[PDB]
Design an enzyme around this catalytic site. Sequence first.
Site, PDB file in Angstrom:
ATOM      1  N   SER A   1       4.362   2.831   8.037  1.00  0.00           N
ATOM      2  CA  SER A   1       3.976   1.456   7.131  1.00  0.00           C
ATOM      3  C   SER A   1       4.797   1.139   6.625  1.00  0.00           C
ATOM      4  CB  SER A   1       2.856   2.135   6.225  1.00  0.00           C
ATOM      5  OG  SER A   1       1.850   2.491   7.301  1.00  0.00           O
ATOM      6  N   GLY A   2       5.681  -0.056   6.281  1.00  0.00           N
ATOM      7  CA  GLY A   2       6.569  -0.798   5.173  1.00  0.00           C
ATOM      8  C   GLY A   2       7.396  -0.831   5.838  1.00  0.00           C
TER       9      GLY A   2
ATOM     10  N   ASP B   1      -0.436  -7.168   1.566  1.00  0.00           N
ATOM     11  CA  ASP B   1       0.169  -6.431   1.802  1.00  0.00           C
ATOM     12  C   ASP B   1       1.583  -6.042   1.583  1.00  0.00           C
ATOM     13  OD1 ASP B   1       0.614  -3.715   1.917  1.00  0.00           O
ATOM     14  OD2 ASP B   1       0.442  -3.216   4.104  1.00  0.00           O
TER      15      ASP B   1
ATOM     16  N   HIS C   1       0.665  -1.018   0.277  1.00  0.00           N
ATOM     17  CA  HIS C   1       0.290  -0.406  -0.157  1.00  0.00           C
ATOM     18  C   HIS C   1       0.667   1.480   0.017  1.00  0.00           C
ATOM     19  CE1 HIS C   1       0.393   0.646   4.385  1.00  0.00           C
ATOM     20  NE2 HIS C   1      -0.213   1.633   4.577  1.00  0.00           N
TER      21      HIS C   1
HETATM   22  C1  LIG Z   1     -10.214   2.090   4.681  1.00  0.00           C
HETATM   23  N1  LIG Z   1      -9.768   1.184   4.466  1.00  0.00           N
HETATM   24  C2  LIG Z   1      -9.410   0.708   2.839  1.00  0.00           C
HETATM   25  C3  LIG Z   1     -10.357   0.033   5.195  1.00  0.00           C
HETATM   26  C4  LIG Z   1      -9.360  -1.236   5.739  1.00  0.00           C
HETATM   27  N2  LIG Z   1      -9.145  -2.419   5.344  1.00  0.00           N
HETATM   28  C5  LIG Z   1      -9.047  -3.140   5.645  1.00  0.00           C
HETATM   29  C6  LIG Z   1      -7.744  -2.496   6.467  1.00  0.00           C
HETATM   30  N3  LIG Z   1      -7.993  -1.205   6.017  1.00  0.00           N
HETATM   31  C7  LIG Z   1      -7.469   0.350   6.936  1.00  0.00           C
HETATM   32  C8  LIG Z   1      -7.389   0.729   7.779  1.00  0.00           C
HETATM   33  C9  LIG Z   1      -7.202   1.508   8.515  1.00  0.00           C
HETATM   34  C10 LIG Z   1      -6.359   3.095   7.839  1.00  0.00           C
HETATM   35  C11 LIG Z   1      -5.658   3.583   8.850  1.00  0.00           C
HETATM   36  C12 LIG Z   1      -6.094   4.736   8.951  1.00  0.00           C
HETATM   37  C13 LIG Z   1      -5.677   6.689   9.520  1.00  0.00           C
HETATM   38  C14 LIG Z   1      -4.164   5.860  10.184  1.00  0.00           C
HETATM   39  C15 LIG Z   1      -3.235   6.672  10.564  1.00  0.00           C
HETATM   40  C16 LIG Z   1      -3.957   8.308  11.263  1.00  0.00           C
HETATM   41  N4  LIG Z   1      -2.913   8.442  11.795  1.00  0.00           N
HETATM   42  O1  LIG Z   1      -4.864   8.717  10.769  1.00  0.00           O
HETATM   43  N5  LIG Z   1      -2.636   5.922  11.017  1.00  0.00           N
HETATM   44  N6  LIG Z   1      -2.961   4.986  10.555  1.00  0.00           N
HETATM   45  C17 LIG Z   1      -1.424   3.583  10.843  1.00  0.00           C
HETATM   46  C18 LIG Z   1      -0.559   3.782   9.684  1.00  0.00           C
HETATM   47  C19 LIG Z   1       0.337   2.264  10.528  1.00  0.00           C
HETATM   48  C20 LIG Z   1       0.215   1.532  11.673  1.00  0.00           C
HETATM   49  O2  LIG Z   1       0.976   0.857  11.881  1.00  0.00           O
HETATM   50  N7  LIG Z   1       0.146   0.321  13.315  1.00  0.00           N
HETATM   51  C21 LIG Z   1      -0.578   1.307  14.035  1.00  0.00           C
HETATM   52  N8  LIG Z   1      -1.535   0.527  14.632  1.00  0.00           N
HETATM   53  C22 LIG Z   1      -0.852   1.848  12.601  1.00  0.00           C
HETATM   54  C23 LIG Z   1      -1.275   2.898  12.493  1.00  0.00           C
HETATM   55  C24 LIG Z   1      -3.754   5.225   9.696  1.00  0.00           C
HETATM   56  C25 LIG Z   1      -4.436   3.538   9.120  1.00  0.00           C
HETATM   57  F1  LIG Z   1      -4.237   2.509   9.334  1.00  0.00           F
HETATM   58  C26 LIG Z   1      -5.865   2.366   6.853  1.00  0.00           C
HETATM   59  F2  LIG Z   1      -4.622   2.922   5.962  1.00  0.00           F
HETATM   60  C27 LIG Z   1      -5.988   1.209   6.379  1.00  0.00           C
END
Ligand SMILES: CN(C)Cc1nccn1-c1ccc(-c2ccc3c(C(N)=O)nn(-c4ccc5onc(N)c5c4)c3c2F)c(F)c1
Lengths: 234, 51
Positions: free
Chosen positions: A185-186, A88, A42
């Site tokens: 991420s990644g 992913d 992603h």
């Molecule tokens: C809408 N989707 C299509 C639905 C769906 N279906 C399957 C998976 N998802 C899905 C759900 C949520 C996010 C999402 C949204 C916002 C954030 C944020 C922010 N700071 O606003 N920070 N992170 C974030 C990054 C990295 C991280 O690592 N560990 C952590 N807790 C962590 C957190 C985020 C997210 F991951 C996503 F990208 C994909």
Amino acid sequence: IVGGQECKDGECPWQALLINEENEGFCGGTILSEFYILTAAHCLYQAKRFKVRVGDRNTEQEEGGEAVHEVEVVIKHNRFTKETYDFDIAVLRLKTPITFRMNVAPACLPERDWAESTLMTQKTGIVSGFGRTHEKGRQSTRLKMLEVPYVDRNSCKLSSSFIITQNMFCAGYDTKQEDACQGDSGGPHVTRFKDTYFVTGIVSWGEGCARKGKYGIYTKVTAFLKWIDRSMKT
Amino acid sequence: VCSLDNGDCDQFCHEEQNSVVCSCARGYTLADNGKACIPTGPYPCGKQTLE
Ligand SMILES: CN(C)Cc1nccn1-c1ccc(-c2ccc3c(C(N)=O)nn(-c4ccc5onc(N)c5c4)c3c2F)c(F)c1
């Protein structure tokens, strides 16, 4: 990274940073060899065209040891999807070979059966990155690392509003405010065994960052070990 | 045997023919004693780098 601590010099040598044309980091990665970097699928379409920086602990100071590398090939998993974020995972072959040295070295790739029985059963893992220090805050100029506990799939699937495939896993705390965040991420999720760190996960997603009743979601590397070897040519 | 002190292996442990067999990651060589893993280069994978 929310909480945790800044990585001491040389402790996160396998950390790689994906940079955009703004010359800023948006996603992280993990060094697997001179020609290879492991990251999240992603992230690939999150900057169109980008570059990989290694051996960077501080993005503010030009310190004096970083390096840049262009991607010669992008290897996105075929079953990857933005809806569930399943599969992913992606590998990146650089155009020129990373020369290992201080703060620049690869994490170990472990064998599947062993990793499942011994690394995934350890109490915790180590996550790192230049990601946000708060849910909606700014990114960190300093490279951070955090120790996150493994969470069993059932508690994981339950705590989640979204589906947790067998290609992902939970790590972190339920209410304790520590977690990975946007920007990480990644990046790498490694697990230490007898003083050697092995690649065990890929920062994937999470409902917000370090909220309550939620954990960090990671790509289960053990489920793609053969894929990685293929992707890196044996 | 792998379920107790990792079959005494430094890294990978596997139970073959009712016995333990250790192995190491690329960049390491299995020791003469069939247990330990000896780094072959200065920057072996999984090791934090020192000056
Ligand atoms: C809408 N989707 C299509 C639905 C769906 N279906 C399957 C998976 N998802 C899905 C759900 C949520 C996010 C999402 C949204 C916002 C954030 C944020 C922010 N700071 O606003 N920070 N992170 C974030 C990054 C990295 C991280 O690592 N560990 C952590 N807790 C962590 C957190 C985020 C997210 F991951 C996503 F990208 C994909």
